[PDB]
Amino acid sequence: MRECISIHVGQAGVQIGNACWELYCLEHGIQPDGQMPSDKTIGGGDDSFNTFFSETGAGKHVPRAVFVDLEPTVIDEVRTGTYRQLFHPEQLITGKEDAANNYARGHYTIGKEIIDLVLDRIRKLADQCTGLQGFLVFHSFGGGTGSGFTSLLMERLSVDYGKKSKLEFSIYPAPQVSTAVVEPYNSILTTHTTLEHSDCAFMVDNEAIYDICRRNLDIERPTYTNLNRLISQIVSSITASLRFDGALNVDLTEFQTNLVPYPRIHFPLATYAPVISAEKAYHEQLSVAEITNACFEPANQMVKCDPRHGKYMACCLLYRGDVVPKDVNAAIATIKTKRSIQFVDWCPTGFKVGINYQPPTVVPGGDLAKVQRAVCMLSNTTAIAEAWARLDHKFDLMYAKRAFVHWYVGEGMEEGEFSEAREDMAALEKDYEEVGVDSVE
Amino acid sequence: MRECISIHVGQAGVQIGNACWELYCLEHGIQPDGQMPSDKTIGGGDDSFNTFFSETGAGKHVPRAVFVDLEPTVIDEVRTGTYRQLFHPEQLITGKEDAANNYARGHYTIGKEIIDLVLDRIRKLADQCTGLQGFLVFHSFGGGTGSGFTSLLMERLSVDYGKKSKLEFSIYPAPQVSTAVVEPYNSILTTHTTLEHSDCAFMVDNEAIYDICRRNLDIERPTYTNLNRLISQIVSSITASLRFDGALNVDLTEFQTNLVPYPRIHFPLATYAPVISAEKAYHEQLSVAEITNACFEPANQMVKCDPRHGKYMACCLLYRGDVVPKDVNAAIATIKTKRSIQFVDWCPTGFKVGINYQPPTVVPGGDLAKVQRAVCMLSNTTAIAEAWARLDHKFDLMYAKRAFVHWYVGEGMEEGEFSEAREDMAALEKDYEEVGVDSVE
Amino acid sequence: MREIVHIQAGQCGNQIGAKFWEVISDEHGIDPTGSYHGDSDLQLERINVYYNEATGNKYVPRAILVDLEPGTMDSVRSGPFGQIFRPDNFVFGQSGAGNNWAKGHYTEGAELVDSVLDVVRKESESCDCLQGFQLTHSLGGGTGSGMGTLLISKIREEYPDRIMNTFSVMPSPKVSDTVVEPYNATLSVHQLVENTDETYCIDNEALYDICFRTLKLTTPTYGDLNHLVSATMSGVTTCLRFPGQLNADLRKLAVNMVPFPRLHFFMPGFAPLTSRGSQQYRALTVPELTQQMFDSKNMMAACDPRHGRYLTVAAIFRGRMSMKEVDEQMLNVQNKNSSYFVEWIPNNVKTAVCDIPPRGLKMSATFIGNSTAIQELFKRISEQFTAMFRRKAFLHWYTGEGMDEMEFTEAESNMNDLVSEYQQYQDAT
Amino acid sequence: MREIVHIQAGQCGNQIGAKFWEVISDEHGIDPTGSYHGDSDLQLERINVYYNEATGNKYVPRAILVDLEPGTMDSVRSGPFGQIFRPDNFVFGQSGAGNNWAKGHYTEGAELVDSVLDVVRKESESCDCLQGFQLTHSLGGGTGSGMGTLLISKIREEYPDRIMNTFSVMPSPKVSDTVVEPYNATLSVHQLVENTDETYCIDNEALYDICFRTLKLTTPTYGDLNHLVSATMSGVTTCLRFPGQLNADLRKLAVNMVPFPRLHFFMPGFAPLTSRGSQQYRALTVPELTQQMFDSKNMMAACDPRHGRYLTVAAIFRGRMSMKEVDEQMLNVQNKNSSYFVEWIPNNVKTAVCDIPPRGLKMSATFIGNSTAIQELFKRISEQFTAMFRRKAFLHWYTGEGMDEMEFTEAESNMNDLVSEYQQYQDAT
Ligand SMILES: CC(=O)O[C@H]1C(=O)[C@@]2(C)[C@H]([C@H](OC(=O)c3ccccc3)[C@]3(O)C[C@H](OC(=O)[C@H](O)[C@@H](NC(=O)c4ccccc4)c4ccccc4)C(C)=C1C3(C)C)[C@]1(OC(C)=O)CO[C@@H]1C[C@@H]2O
Ligand SMILES: CC(=O)O[C@H]1C(=O)[C@@]2(C)[C@H]([C@H](OC(=O)c3ccccc3)[C@]3(O)C[C@H](OC(=O)[C@H](O)[C@@H](NC(=O)c4ccccc4)c4ccccc4)C(C)=C1C3(C)C)[C@]1(OC(C)=O)CO[C@@H]1C[C@@H]2O
Ligand SMILES: Nc1nc2c(ncn2[C@@H]2O[C@H](COP(=O)(O)OP(=O)(O)O)[C@@H](O)[C@H]2O)c(=O)[nH]1
Ligand SMILES: Nc1nc2c(ncn2[C@@H]2O[C@H](COP(=O)(O)OP(=O)(O)O)[C@@H](O)[C@H]2O)c(=O)[nH]1
């Protein structure tokens, strides 16, 4: 059984998961009290709730997910909220003080105190698995728990397990919008485990999502609650071919085989094409052809980036619903035709399509409309180096005067560690300079 | 008929028995006024009340148990309480002053005055037996009656009877928690009869039970009343295959044959796996496989101990309820697989399973939930030597200055007896050093 | 003529035989009460092989139930088939065996065996012309091992020429549910060597393996594994009870299964075994059944025949079948697999063919193999034995009961000598 | 006689064969449940070429379904035709292949192939006189490519003289839906060279082109393209199953299709293909069908024959037809187009004529071509291969799984050598 583990770390990581685990409840037809209703005398793990829901006896569905925070407060929104009996009580693990936007606290001081209790929750879910697929860590670069703790966990998960996929859903720091002033300190130090221990790190940021809500979608005033329903449709599609039938299904490992060229070039941005408001959902031509072109739009990116500034290296089309493939292959051939879209010269064969039959669900009270088709495009590009150049420069400014150093050293790390994680990220940005360039003879 | 004798000595020994004889009343369907209700026109000693209940004429069930105390006060909680007509009047034997945390008083001074009246109660129950199995002494090491009197009785029970099993349910002194300061004096002196006269001594202690209530069970604030319902499920399962049908039944003597290697290596700790609170009883996977693994947990121990510090020598699985054996044999083979679990090198064949069909009863107002399966694991390990090293050191501290010696000598024992019972326990702890070690050639 | 006395002994012995006399009692159309409700007069011609007819056409088996514990007897009495036995054949003590060999063979066994051999003589003095006996018991129990081998070693003094065979369950190291089952199995292998004519070694793991892989069961109990075993025990003496084209008694097997004395440890096998649903997808034929009887995954002994050579086999078919296909399939096997057979014996296979299949299908078969690969059993025990005994663990519960050490060392050597008897007869030309 | 074992492998393999045994199961009037519901006794004379008759006139194919992923098997079971297979032939692992060649050929393939060759021997030991095998698989998948070529290279060690052919789907650069399909196709072309008797190279673009232009379909799925392909695979072995005027087995083609060893890569073709509606406007005749079989737009391989020369072709007609018109049309072609044929072979065409058309029309035909123009396939791959491999992209997912570089460089050279084998046999007199 294609089972998978969600881990939701820190405030952002928890609050995304609300929006994730809201959705799968609708995907598999599960009430917020964990119950499938009486109109499901059909095949459950044939609808495959069984990758995200261990079926407790007597018709009861509890996730394979763990909600971890160093602060009591965030998870206590999940107790009560409405999800107060969806979750297993023992998978909502609270500390007492958060890392408090301090990587040294989340990794050394506070994080170690709950790390074995969290790893022991993993084993209780790891031993219930048959054919474990991998882990889905959610966090934010630029928290304390999202960076400090996640770094501590990913070390321990690499040692105990090794073999499985470990996906990350990070939130990257936005170039203008930021709310912590040590936001770049906590991102340089999380660089270390993100490239080494994760197998595929995704990056999103809040400004590139603000664009999409306002422009494609005509929401006046987004909150985090609005953005995370969007986040969840990207992840819901990723992991949908594990758990629904379709031609050209794609396991969690078939991403990495088809998306990732080299060891540490594993930072693909996602998109999602049918972000359409109810009114704008008429005046649609929402065919396969238009929605494939919309993925390649530099405005429909989930990262503050412009693929017109770099070259794509792989793409990866994951479609849901009322789909005929030859419409897709004719829309690929258009994509190969255009010269505004630069692939690299060593790719040649562009990219991997994957289709699934299960259409998305419209989240109730949600922002989307009812669409028939839907497409994430996970896509390596050299344009995500530009996100890095805009953030190294913020780190290099503050660390030039050794600003907030005294908080960090007095918590269980060294001054020396800044100089290593800065070199470490400077080497990544040098890899994408050398991976964009073709070789000639 | 598979009959058995409970003897409940001292304050702790009585107050456990309340929680034991509460339970069997529910096991066999007996009201607190000793009556089976009208809906039992089925086979009584076929449900085999007849190991713990001599059926008085006219449908009335009185135990084969004797409640002994040197103090009037404890048993007077049983007269009245609610059990005031469950018990035979003549099996509630009171002294007038307790031994008063003084072994010399419980064994020589006060104990001899009631010892023949207690042995004569045994004969009145011994002669009513057909196929007497053995005795179940309950007490605490570190009382006066629990140590001094129990030592006196076990001498007399070995002489009159010899042949039968004599189980003990001791409470061992906890390393931090203690309430008597001569607690180690009374434990060194009870060492003598525990290894010599008992056939199988169990040890529990209060801290290792505090853990389980708080952690597995989410009780905020345990009392003795809470702990002893737990104690009683361990004993209720031990003696359940005598008195219910199941495949692989296990008599009282089949423990000792399968649990006990050598003459004095007969100190097995028990566990119990489904200690689950009502809320945490959903979010269960409470299969046979998980509940077998839970026995081998160093946290689910009934002794302040960590089997990761010693090697198991035998184990002994006693299961109740909705059980398919092949699930068990596949869970054994997992246990043999792991290298965190050290058996010894002369065991090879690990351990003995036993199954019973009768599911536990949820004690009303009790702490457990409704579980379908349940497992005690009686298990010899070399890790119980560690409980001893932590208590000899407390004895050796106080006896270095000959502290409370003047109370003991002036009551009917010698200074010389401390030096013999210290050597006696030092030899046990030397046996487990020499029984953990394999022989090589 | 050719009666069989059944001595089911111990807990395990009683469970199998409970299910055993539920099959035989279906073979001959015996009511639960003990009346006859068949239609075919084949069921009665040879009913007397197992059943005493009593007054007014009730049919009481010739089985004797022995125990050292009242429990199993009360279960059987109170069940569906309590009515079928004679109540003077429920012979039982009160004090349990301890899963201790000494306790069932010397102390508490010897006390009872007088009151049981007196029941053996009720049965043996009533028969026309007795053929054989049979224990159903367990090497690894107290009464199955100890009391069983006391009953055996006291029947050879009375009835020294009847085919006495056992269906003995042998321990497997993968599935352990008793700590001293090496002690209890070693001291009874010692007795089965010198005293028995045929020994059908059965394991536990080999029966799950049939349930999981072949039958596609989910959740096996003792109830299910012995339901298999009873379909083997029915097959053994089929041609004793039904007419056939080749007949084959107990004695007929014994004679040409057993090259040397002492090597009388057989590996059964049954075929067919399908799941329900997967029955309309196998065509049921003699080459279909032959392939199951020689596949390793249909052995009720937890060994692989490929770790040795069959000395001899017997093939007992039950059904309206041909003789060429039988004589050919049994030929094409000992040609294609000629290195899996001992070559100093021509025609390793004996066929027997009955006419009467079990009461649900056509064309069953039963494989009974004298393979050299059974020393894999005796060594896995004599490694556990020698690992506990070097410490002298669990010794006082044995020396306490009338035994001593020198019974152990000799019994260990009698097991380890016959490992060097299967070994000699595997290799060396 | 002349049985065919079917090994459908991978995801693609299972989809085609799902639709393949929906055609064959119509050729012989097999019910979805597995009973027979025909009327003509032609359907049964040679049913045994594909179907084991089982107990009580049910017909179980001789197909084995292999996968490294439970999904396709559960789909097929739960569909219209789940009932038809034997449930012991649904052999599958749990961990997916990765669309990785190494993962299906070394790590997770080798683990399973033991449990599959044991199913090959269930099938091969039941046949009267086996003719051949067949994979249905995909060069560009994990299990289709990797596990397929592990199964093949282990059958040549067992059954070294049976016609083993593949219907392999080959990648096209116009339609890409996997990034490393050059890696996965290169390492399996290497195995198909030395191990296979005939190889029917099929593409994707060539099947849309038939749907769009000829059939006038709107919206093709895998469901529709393999429905075509299965009408080719039926045609191949028609004269093996039906009586004809010229017969032609698997072996008959093989022999005179293949000049040199190693050049066993064929281009199928089917005719007729009309839309519905445009059927009453074509007169259906032998010159009508011949013109479709030689037109480039009816090739199921995405090439143009005009970029080379046919070495040899075979023409397999199915229907009540003449022999002069056949013998003439096949003559008038290799005269008018004599520069499109290799001239060192006289009579490039082999005709076979069956008597039994498909179950909707008269007079079908099947073109199977050994053209030199198939090096257009091998070069379009060995350009993508050499463009990724010069960077060593996607390498750690391969060297991680037991492979190394030197398996690549040799496998690239084995593909690039046979480009220089079609090249030699196109030109040079
Ligand atoms: C339509 C049909 O043919 O059904 C068969 C059947 O499907 C199969 C699968 C049966 C079936 O057996 C089981 O499923 C099974 C259940 C528990 C324990 C062991 C097996 C069957 O239940 C059992 C049943 O057996 C008999 O009736 C024999 O007489 C058998 N008798 C019993 O053990 C028995 C069963 C139930 C009640 C009372 C007695 C026997 C075999 C050898 C020697 C003496 C007697 C049969 C043939 C079948 C069913 C009914 C489905 C099989 O078993 C036996 C012992 O025959 C399992 O593998 C064999 C092959 C059979 O073909
Ligand atoms: C009235 C009439 O003559 O109609 C024809 C028809 O119009 C044509 C266009 C058919 C038709 O086929 C298709 O349109 C088609 C659909 C999906 C994929 C591939 C083709 C036909 O559907 C398919 C159908 O095929 C058969 O019945 C064969 O036995 C065929 N069987 C199947 O594949 C099958 C399909 C659907 C339902 C049941 C069976 C076969 C072919 C080769 C080997 C074995 C079996 C036929 C002759 C026709 C229709 C019905 C319109 C054609 O195809 C076949 C496979 O024969 C397409 O080009 C040919 C030429 C036929 O003349
Ligand atoms: N198949 C099988 N039979 C057993 C096993 N253990 C004991 N037996 C049988 O049970 C009988 C021996 O009794 P035992 O179970 O020791 O008796 P008790 O333990 O006092 O009730 C014999 O007939 C044995 O063949 C076992 O593990 N498997
Ligand atoms: N023709 C073809 N077959 C494919 C393609 N991708 C995978 N396959 C086939 O699918 C099988 C692998 O199964 P896969 O799709 O990986 O299974 P998953 O775990 O469900 O993704 C192999 O037999 C492949 O040859 C493709 O692009 N084309």
GROMACS .gro file of N, CA, C and O in nm, chain B residues 6-21 66-69 74-75 136-141 145-146 150 169-171 224 228:
model
  144
  447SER      N    1  -0.592  -1.723   4.763
  447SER     CA    2  -0.534  -1.590   4.777
  447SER      C    3  -0.511  -1.562   4.927
  447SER      O    4  -0.592  -1.596   5.013
  448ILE      N    5  -0.392  -1.510   4.958
  448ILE     CA    6  -0.362  -1.453   5.089
  448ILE      C    7  -0.315  -1.308   5.072
  448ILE      O    8  -0.219  -1.278   5.000
  449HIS      N    9  -0.380  -1.216   5.146
  449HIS     CA   10  -0.365  -1.071   5.133
  449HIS      C   11  -0.318  -1.014   5.266
  449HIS      O   12  -0.396  -1.006   5.360
  450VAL      N   13  -0.191  -0.976   5.268
  450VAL     CA   14  -0.119  -0.950   5.391
  450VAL      C   15  -0.079  -0.804   5.392
  450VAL      O   16  -0.021  -0.754   5.297
  451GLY      N   17  -0.112  -0.738   5.503
  451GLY     CA   18  -0.068  -0.601   5.525
  451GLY      C   19  -0.161  -0.503   5.454
  451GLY      O   20  -0.261  -0.541   5.394
  452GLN      N   21  -0.124  -0.375   5.458
  452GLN     CA   22  -0.217  -0.273   5.413
  452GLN      C   23  -0.228  -0.277   5.260
  452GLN      O   24  -0.338  -0.272   5.204
  453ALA      N   25  -0.111  -0.285   5.194
  453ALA     CA   26  -0.100  -0.291   5.049
  453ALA      C   27  -0.159  -0.421   4.996
  453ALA      O   28  -0.225  -0.422   4.893
  454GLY      N   29  -0.138  -0.529   5.072
  454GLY     CA   30  -0.185  -0.659   5.029
  454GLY      C   31  -0.337  -0.666   5.036
  454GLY      O   32  -0.400  -0.729   4.953
  455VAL      N   33  -0.396  -0.597   5.134
  455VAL     CA   34  -0.540  -0.597   5.144
  455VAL      C   35  -0.601  -0.514   5.033
  455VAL      O   36  -0.695  -0.552   4.962
  456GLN      N   37  -0.540  -0.398   5.017
  456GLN     CA   38  -0.601  -0.297   4.934
  456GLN      C   39  -0.587  -0.327   4.784
  456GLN      O   40  -0.659  -0.267   4.702
  457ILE      N   41  -0.494  -0.417   4.747
  457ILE     CA   42  -0.484  -0.476   4.614
  457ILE      C   43  -0.600  -0.572   4.597
  457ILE      O   44  -0.664  -0.582   4.493
  458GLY      N   45  -0.622  -0.647   4.702
  458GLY     CA   46  -0.720  -0.752   4.693
  458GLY      C   47  -0.858  -0.694   4.674
  458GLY      O   48  -0.951  -0.764   4.639
  459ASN      N   49  -0.874  -0.571   4.717
  459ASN     CA   50  -1.003  -0.513   4.693
  459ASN      C   51  -1.019  -0.501   4.543
  459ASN      O   52  -1.129  -0.500   4.491
  460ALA      N   53  -0.907  -0.471   4.481
  460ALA     CA   54  -0.915  -0.441   4.341
  460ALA      C   55  -0.913  -0.575   4.263
  460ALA      O   56  -0.957  -0.583   4.147
  461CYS      N   57  -0.858  -0.683   4.323
  461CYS     CA   58  -0.865  -0.816   4.264
  461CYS      C   59  -1.006  -0.869   4.275
  461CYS      O   60  -1.065  -0.912   4.178
  462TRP      N   61  -1.055  -0.871   4.398
  462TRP     CA   62  -1.180  -0.940   4.420
  462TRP      C   63  -1.297  -0.853   4.376
  462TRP      O   64  -1.409  -0.898   4.376
  507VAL      N   65  -0.793  -1.519   5.207
  507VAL     CA   66  -0.781  -1.485   5.348
  507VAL      C   67  -0.722  -1.346   5.362
  507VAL      O   68  -0.613  -1.325   5.313
  508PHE      N   69  -0.792  -1.250   5.428
  508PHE     CA   70  -0.740  -1.115   5.449
  508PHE      C   71  -0.686  -1.102   5.590
  508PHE      O   72  -0.758  -1.113   5.689
  509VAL      N   73  -0.554  -1.083   5.593
  509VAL     CA   74  -0.476  -1.085   5.714
  509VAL      C   75  -0.411  -0.948   5.730
  509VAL      O   76  -0.349  -0.895   5.637
  510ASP      N   77  -0.429  -0.894   5.850
  510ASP     CA   78  -0.359  -0.775   5.891
  510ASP      C   79  -0.337  -0.780   6.041
  510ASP      O   80  -0.419  -0.836   6.113
  515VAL      N   81  -0.738  -0.169   5.848
  515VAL     CA   82  -0.745  -0.173   5.703
  515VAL      C   83  -0.863  -0.257   5.657
  515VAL      O   84  -0.928  -0.229   5.558
  516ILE      N   85  -0.881  -0.367   5.728
  516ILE     CA   86  -0.980  -0.462   5.687
  516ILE      C   87  -1.117  -0.407   5.720
  516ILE      O   88  -1.214  -0.455   5.666
  577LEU      N   89  -0.144  -1.756   4.648
  577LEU     CA   90  -0.116  -1.626   4.589
  577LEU      C   91  -0.105  -1.529   4.705
  577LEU      O   92  -0.205  -1.475   4.756
  578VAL      N   93   0.019  -1.511   4.750
  578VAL     CA   94   0.046  -1.415   4.857
  578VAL      C   95   0.062  -1.275   4.797
  578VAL      O   96   0.139  -1.256   4.703
  579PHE      N   97  -0.015  -1.181   4.851
  579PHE     CA   98   0.000  -1.042   4.813
  579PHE      C   99   0.053  -0.969   4.934
  579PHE      O  100   0.005  -0.991   5.044
  580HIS      N  101   0.147  -0.880   4.907
  580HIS     CA  102   0.210  -0.800   5.009
  580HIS      C  103   0.288  -0.686   4.944
  580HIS      O  104   0.276  -0.661   4.824
  581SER      N  105   0.371  -0.618   5.025
  581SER     CA  106   0.467  -0.518   4.979
  581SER      C  107   0.599  -0.541   5.054
  581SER      O  108   0.596  -0.550   5.175
  582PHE      N  109   0.712  -0.554   4.984
  582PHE     CA  110   0.838  -0.538   5.056
  582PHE      C  111   0.847  -0.396   5.110
  582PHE      O  112   0.841  -0.303   5.030
  586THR      N  113   0.400  -0.584   5.809
  586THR     CA  114   0.319  -0.703   5.794
  586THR      C  115   0.346  -0.763   5.657
  586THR      O  116   0.348  -0.885   5.640
  587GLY      N  117   0.362  -0.676   5.558
  587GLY     CA  118   0.396  -0.724   5.425
  587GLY      C  119   0.531  -0.798   5.415
  587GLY      O  120   0.552  -0.872   5.320
  591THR      N  121   0.481  -1.206   5.626
  591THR     CA  122   0.484  -1.285   5.504
  591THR      C  123   0.600  -1.385   5.511
  591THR      O  124   0.588  -1.498   5.465
  610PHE      N  125   0.302  -1.153   4.482
  610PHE     CA  126   0.284  -1.026   4.415
  610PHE      C  127   0.334  -0.918   4.508
  610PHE      O  128   0.255  -0.867   4.587
  611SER      N  129   0.464  -0.892   4.501
  611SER     CA  130   0.524  -0.792   4.586
  611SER      C  131   0.514  -0.655   4.520
  611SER      O  132   0.501  -0.643   4.398
  612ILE      N  133   0.526  -0.554   4.606
  612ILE     CA  134   0.561  -0.421   4.561
  612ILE      C  135   0.702  -0.394   4.609
  612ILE      O  136   0.733  -0.403   4.727
  665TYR      N  137  -0.342   0.502   4.488
  665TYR     CA  138  -0.329   0.356   4.494
  665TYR      C  139  -0.447   0.286   4.429
  665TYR      O  140  -0.431   0.174   4.382
  669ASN      N  141  -0.386  -0.026   4.141
  669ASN     CA  142  -0.421  -0.163   4.171
  669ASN      C  143  -0.522  -0.225   4.074
  669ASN      O  144  -0.525  -0.347   4.070
   0.00000   0.00000   0.00000
